[PDB]
Amino acid sequence: GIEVLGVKTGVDSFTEVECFLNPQMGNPDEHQKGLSKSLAAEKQFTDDSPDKEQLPCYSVARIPLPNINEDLTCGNILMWEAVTVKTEVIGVTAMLNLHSGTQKTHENGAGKPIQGSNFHFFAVGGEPLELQGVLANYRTKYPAQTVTPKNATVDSQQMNTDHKAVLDKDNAYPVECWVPDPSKNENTRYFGTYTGGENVPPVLHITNTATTVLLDEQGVGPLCKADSLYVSAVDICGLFTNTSGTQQWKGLPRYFKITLRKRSVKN
Amino acid sequence: SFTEVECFLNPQMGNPDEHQKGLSKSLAAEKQFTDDSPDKEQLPCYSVARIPLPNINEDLTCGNILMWEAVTVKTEVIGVTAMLNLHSGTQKTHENGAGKPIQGSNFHFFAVGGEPLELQGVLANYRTKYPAQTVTPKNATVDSQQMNTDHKAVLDKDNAYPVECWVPDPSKNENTRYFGTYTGGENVPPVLHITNTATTVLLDEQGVGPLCKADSLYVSAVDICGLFTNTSGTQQWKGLPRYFKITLRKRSVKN
Amino acid sequence: GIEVLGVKTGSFTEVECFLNPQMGNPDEHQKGLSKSLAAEKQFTDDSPDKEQLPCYSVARIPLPNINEDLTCGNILMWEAVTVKTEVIGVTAMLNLHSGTQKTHENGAGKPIQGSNFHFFAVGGEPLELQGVLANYRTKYPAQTVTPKNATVDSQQMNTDHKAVLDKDNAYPVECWVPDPSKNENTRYFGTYTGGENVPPVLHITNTATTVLLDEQGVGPLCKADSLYVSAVDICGLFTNTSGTQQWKGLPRYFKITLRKRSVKN
Amino acid sequence: GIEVLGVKTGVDSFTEVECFLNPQMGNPDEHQKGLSKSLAAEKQFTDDSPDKEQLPCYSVARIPLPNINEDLTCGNILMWEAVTVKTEVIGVTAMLNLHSGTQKTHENGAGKPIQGSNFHFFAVGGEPLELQGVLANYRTKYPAQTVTPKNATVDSQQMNTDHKAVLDKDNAYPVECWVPDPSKNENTRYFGTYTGGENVPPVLHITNTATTVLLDEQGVGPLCKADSLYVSAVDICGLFTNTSGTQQWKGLPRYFKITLRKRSVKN
Amino acid sequence: IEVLGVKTGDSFTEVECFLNPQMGNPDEHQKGLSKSLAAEKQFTDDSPDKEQLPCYSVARIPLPNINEDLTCGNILMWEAVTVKTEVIGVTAMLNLHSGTQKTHENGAGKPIQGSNFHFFAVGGEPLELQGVLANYRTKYPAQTVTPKNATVDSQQMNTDHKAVLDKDNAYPVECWVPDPSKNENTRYFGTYTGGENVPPVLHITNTATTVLLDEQGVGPLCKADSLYVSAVDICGLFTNTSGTQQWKGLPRYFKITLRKRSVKN
Structure with missing residues (x-):
């Protein structure tokens, strides 16, 4: 695809960008941002x-x-190369509120903390994240305004190589339908952890001293096509339990801080 | 001198009918x-x-030939977010609550080798009457619940060797690398990581990776994620596919 | 920011500090605890x-x-290099007889457990905070500093909620987190664990040191000759005989080593 | 101890030995190898x-x-020196059988998996493993067919330095009576983990890529007396629950693969 | 104490020690246990x-x-360099039949579990302690050394509660922790776990060594040719048939290696 050349060093060679990404849990109404709509079972x-x-x-x-690039008609041009990222989950202490709309754990007791299944995930790339579709139930009838696997079949619950896509739209690709595709994503780095179980305790660390390096085995980080940097994220913290017993997913925002350098490439 | 191959392996949980691929049949107890x-x-x-x-190669009567040597592997469990579906055919944790997530005993395992994975048989109940269409330990005896060195086999057939009957044999497998973790308990939470930045090196203490006999590379896997609980309370194993990406180099060997 | 020069040699100094927890202290007899917690x-x-x-x-x-003259082109500042930090009184929770609720007939008291949050920071200036709310319509009491003009977006990102930790026992933990988009002159570390049955796990030692230098080899530079230490140590919930619960906290110790750094002025 | 001299390896200086060790849980009858007899309580x-x-x-x-073939009349001889070990627990997938004689977890549910207290342990030495006795109840009346602490007293529930022994007989020394003695065992390397609690989930890893080095701080591995080696093991996986509710310990076999070299010692 | 560079040689030595636990020992038949625990x-x-x-x-x-003469300007002291340490008798808890409470009809006895605390220290002098109380109004018995003049602040920081571990079986674990603002001549390590259902996790081996040298490359220096070893090993709670509970402890082994160090005086 791309012939990679020398890295530009010294002054005016680096740059930093940052970003706060809101979660997309569902937002049933205007007063419930950060949550989903009460969930249905059975x-x-x-x-x-x-x-x-x-x-x-x-x-x-x-x-x-x-x-x-002053001149986009040249043999050699330069691209931005993502080198490192600091990333953080925002508002973890908010869940120490056990009095607002909670269900008591017992008589005279405090409210039940948010807990259960969770999924924390982030990616950095020079292009949209490439996805592979997998379904728990291939006969699920997904709503309009969501991009889900087309022509879902028997094999969509295991491997169906037809379900390829890219993360090009916010709040459109349901988490339960898509995973990052390991057979692609040559120009993206991604990291995720899933934990299942209704009583699973959230464990969330915060610091400004942790850095992730984005260079591959060749010493090359993601190269930003069309001068665009893509950041993707999911941060399902668990389930919120209402006084009534109804539950809805909780999410939290995510922060990014990426450092990039100029690399020469062949055009 | 180098080359890459990749592979998606479907799970083999049982597949009771065309609508339930990835699941086992309903499990029996007692x-x-x-x-x-x-x-x-x-x-x-x-x-x-x-x-x-x-x-x-071109004349295998020569004293010196080249073989493919497996050097590294990237491997990944496919579709972990699928289990965030808590509405399809699930059982509610409580009145008004969401469905109960997949959980319980699990086993995640993969192997890379230049020949079929060598197995050793061990049985929980040596008197179990195993069905046709499966390869299980022959002439199972009292000792099949501990060490019975007669139960040797190789993983040469897909969807045939029951997980509960066989383990990789540590006294062999000189030309294979394998890795597995078992977790037991009906309420055990699945913990599954995904990334494209993790690589496993397949060279042994001598600096030699698996050598592919007959120009064949073998990949094996089990990925039992836990139990799915139906609304009625009946349960079935859940599995997910596994991806492989192996890098190989040309090596010189005796003949 | 500040352009740093060279480090004084052969120049050092150490400072230490015990910080009390601020859980609420409902009366004179219940320091280390919050007031009874409400639900629903x-x-x-x-x-x-x-x-x-x-x-x-x-x-x-x-x-x-x-410094003697702050008009000089070269000036010295204290630079925080390392910290040892410790949670004080972890064995106190082995008291299962004082005001406890028995786990069963004939049993011992229920140990402190549940959601917890352990956090510390070291910086040459106050810790910079970002506001996030679980419920943006919460009516917070007087004598506390919480996010102003809380809106719909205060439950996710509302970049208006910026603040600094300049006052003790004033900024509610449930309202604020350290701001990762700032804090260039501070180092912070925290872990949150949620769930009412979560077991506390707490390690103690005098052999663990944290290095405070950044990727450039520079530690926090203390502005106005001031060093700031911040902390939260919510260990979990204490269960009264009646079943009513209240947060437990413990003090935290700091021991910081600093060096003199020449700085451009 | 034994006086050793420097290392000098050549050709024909190495060797490997392997071993499968069966568990000794009790074996109530012929059909129940790898299990114990139903356990009593209260x-x-x-x-x-x-x-x-x-x-x-x-x-x-x-x-x-x-x-x-060394003649031990001269002051300088050769001994086998244990250098590395690979060790493995055999048959971990067997516990995925939840249908044979199990107790269901709930109406229409699968059988309850083996779980609870466990103890996994192995040792390699050039002589029998040296043991120290400790008892939960010093007044326990142990059956004649076992080697247990002699003249057990009040202090046998803590430190009683009289209870010294060696692991020289298989299926004779009850796990609940003995631990390896840290004040001895100069010529043995041992490793063990105990986990307590009736609902504890077994966690068991398998691989052929993990090696343990047996050399001490001086760079000397166990020296094998009379050209003999000793391997010891316990692998209590947890409790098996019968349909009725009675429980029995479960054990699994253990594999060893030891590499040795010839070493000069002072006789 | 000012130290000199390291010496060679007849320059080394090893000492070992088995330390019994001090859980309470309600009678002659119940060593390693505490008395039945009160609650509420x-x-x-x-x-x-x-x-x-x-x-x-x-x-x-x-x-x-x-040393022949301790008035000489140049003296030798023993310097603790490494320690191997081990918890003794972990398999004893595989006894589920002696005086136990069954988990269910036909079931085995309930294993020891719950809150635990495992701790050890090595030093050239007694371990220095800081007092912290769960309940400052607790009336402690006369066979114990506890914080004097306990006040409102004894549940958080009260810097008056300083002490040293100079007596075996006298300083209640629930009253004292090692003081991080001192202990320059001691190395300590501890972990607390809270919760009545917490599973004990205990590892044993003869291949694990801890190094006792500080960031300067100096280990504890044994004053008056004496070494101090301290320990707590609360494994959890033992449950009787009746439902009553008492703490369980196990002995601890030490094996310390020391070298001769030149020092100034």
């Missing part, structure tokens, strides 16, 4: 039609970078 | 030791695929 | 007392003055 | 006489090495 | 028996004399 396989507000989606933001 | 006859669809089996590589 | 309150009518809300702890530590 | 401190089949014991095997 | 007691009327309170363990170990 739906029959052949009659499951979930609302969009019940389905958390991938978050994505494209970050525009400074144009580094 | 069966008598002397009368336990499981259906094949109730028994998850090892997955295996043989990958053909480019031919590199 | 209506989103549009939730008015928590101050004593129910644990707050960030902070202390500003004055350092020796090093 | 027994009185002063009248507690457990059956041998209820008590798991240490496993041990003496392994013969190639005779280096 | 009133804050203002809580008087624990000594046998209900586990205490720190401590031994002083005498070392070979090395």
Whole structure:
């Protein structure tokens, strides 16, 4: 694809960009941002039609970078190369509120903390994140305003190589439908952890001293095509339990801080 | 001198019908030791695929030839977010609550080798009556619940060797590298990591990776994620596919 | 920011500090605890007392003055290099007889457990904060500093909620987190664990050191000859005989080593 | 101890030995190898006489090495020196059988997996493993077919330095009576982990790529007396629960693969 | 103490020690256990028996004399360099039949579990302690050394509560922690886990060594040719058939290597 050349060093060679990404859990109304719509259980396989507000989606933001080429008709040009990232989950202490709309754990007791299944994930790339579709129930009837696997079949619950896509739209790709495709993503770095179980305790660390290096085995980081940097994220912290017993997913925003350098490439 | 091959391996949990791929049949309990006859669809089996590589020799009567040597592997579990579906055919944790997530006993395992994975048989109940269409330990005896060195086999057939019957044999497998973790308990939470930045090196303490005999590369896997609980309370194993990406180099060997 | 020069040699100094927790302290007899915690309150009518809300702890530590003339092109500042930090009184929770609730007939008291948050920071200036709310319509008490003009977006990103930890027992933990888009002159570390049955796990030692230098080899530079230490140590919930619960906190110790650095002025 | 001199390896200076060790959980009858007899509870401190089949014991095997044919009349001889070991627990997937004689977890549910307290342990030495006795109840009346601490007293529940022994017999030394003695065992390397709690989930890893080095701080591995090697093991995986509710310890076999070299010692 | 560079040689030595636990020992038949534990007691009327309170363990170990005259300007002291340490008798808890409570109909006995605390220290002098109390109004028995003049602040920081571990089986674990603002001549390590259902996790081996040298490359220097070892090993709670509970402890082994160090005086 791209012939990679020398890295420009010294002054006016580096740059930093930052970004706060909101979660996309569903947002049933205006007062419930950060949550999903009350969740439904025990739906029959052949009659499951979930609302969009019940389905958390991938978050994505494209970050525009400074144009580094005065002349786009040259043999050698330069591209921005992502070198490192600091990333952080925002508002973890908010869950120490056990009094607002909570269900008591017992008589005279405090409210039940947010807990259960979770998924924390982030990616950095010079292009949209490439996805592969996998379904728990291939007969699920997904709502309009969501991009899900087309022509879902028997094999969509295992390997169906037809379900390829890219994360090009925010709050559109349901988390439960898509995973990052390991057979692609040559120009993206991604990291995720899934934990399942309704009583699973969230464990969340914060610091400004942790850095992730984005260079590959060749010493090359993601190269930003069209002077665009893509950041993607999912941060399902668990389930919020209402006084009534109804539950909805909780999400939190995510921060990015990426350092890039100029690399020469062949045009 | 170098080359890459990749592979998606489907899980083999049982597949009771075309609408339930990835699942096992409904699991049975409390069966008598002397009368336990499981259906094949109730028994998850090892997955295996043989990958053909480019031919590199021309006269195998020569003293010195080239073989493909497996150097590194990237491997990944496919579809982990699928389990965030808590509405399809699930059982509610409580009145008004969401569905119960997949959980319980699990087993995640992969291997890379220049020949079929060598197995050793061990049985929980040596008197189990295993179905046709499966390869289980022959002439199972009292000692099959501990060490019975007669139960040797190789993983040469997909969806045939029941996971609960066989383990990789540590006294062999000189030409294979394998890795596995078992977790037991009905409430065990699955913990699954994904990334494209993790690489496993396949060279041994001598600096030699698996040498591919007959220009064949073998990949094996089991990925039992846990139990799916139906609304009625009945349960079935859940599995997910596994991806492989192996890098190989040409090596010189005796003949 | 500040352009740094060279380091004084052969020049050092150490400072230490015990920081009390600020869980709420409902009365003179219950230091280290919050007030009894409420549950199941209506989103549009939730008015928590101050004593129910644990707050960030902070202390500003004055350092020796090093300069005679601040018009000089080269000036010296104290540079924080390492810290040892420790949670004080972890064995106190082995008391299962004082005001406890028995786990069963004939059993011992229920140990402190549940959601926890352990956090510390070292910087040459106050810790910079970002506001995030679980419920943006919460009516916070007087005598506390919380996010101003809270809106719909205060439950996710609202970049208007910026603040600094300049006051002890004032900033509720549940309202603020350290701001990763700032804090260039501070190092912070924290872990949150959620769940009412979560077991506390707490290590103690005098052999663990944290290095405070950044990727450039520069530690926090202390502005106005001031060193700031901040902390939260919510260990979990204490369960009274009656079943009513209240947060438990413990003090935190700091031991910081600093060197003189020449700085451009 | 033994006086050793520097290392000098050549050709024909190495060798490997391997071994499968069966577990010794009790074996209540022929059909229940790898299990113990149903366990008792709530027994009185002063009248507690457990059956041998209820008590798991240490496993041990003496392994013969190639005779280096040294005449021990001279001050300088050769001994086998254990350098590395690969070790593995055999048959971990067997516990994925949840249908044979199990107790269901709930209506229409699968059988309850093996779980609870466990202990996994192995040792390699040039002589029998040296043991120290410690008892939970010093007044326990142990069955004749076991080696247990002699003249057990009040202090046998803490430190009683009289209870010294060696692991020289297989299926004789009850696990609950003995631990390896840290004040001895100069010529043995041992490793063990205990986990307590009736609902503890077993976690068991398998691989053929993990090696343990047996050299001490001086760079000397176990020196094998009389051209003999010793391997010891315990692998209590947890409790098996019958349909009725009775429980029995489960064990699994253990594999060893030891590499040795010839070493000069002072005789 | 000002140290000199390291010496060679007849320059080394090893000492070992088995330390019994001090859980309370309610009678001759119940060593390694505490007395049955009380619960739900009133804050203002809580008087624990000594046998209900586990205490720190401590031994002083005498070392070979090395100086003829302690008035000389250049002296030798023993310097602790490494330690191997081990918990003794972990398999004893595989006894689920002696005086146990069954988990269910037909089931085995309930294993020891719950809150635990495992801790050890090596130093050239007694371990220095800081007092912290869960309930400052607790009335401690006369066979114990506890914080004097306990006040409101004894539940957080009260810098008056300083002490040293100079007596075995006298300093209640729930009252004292090692003081991080001192202990320059001691190395300590501890972990607390809280929760009544917490599973004990205990590793044993003879291949693990801890190095006792500080960031300067100096280990504890044994004053008056004496070495101090301290320990706590609360494994959890033992549950009787009746449902009553008592702490369980196990002995701890030490093996320390020392070298002769030149020092100034």
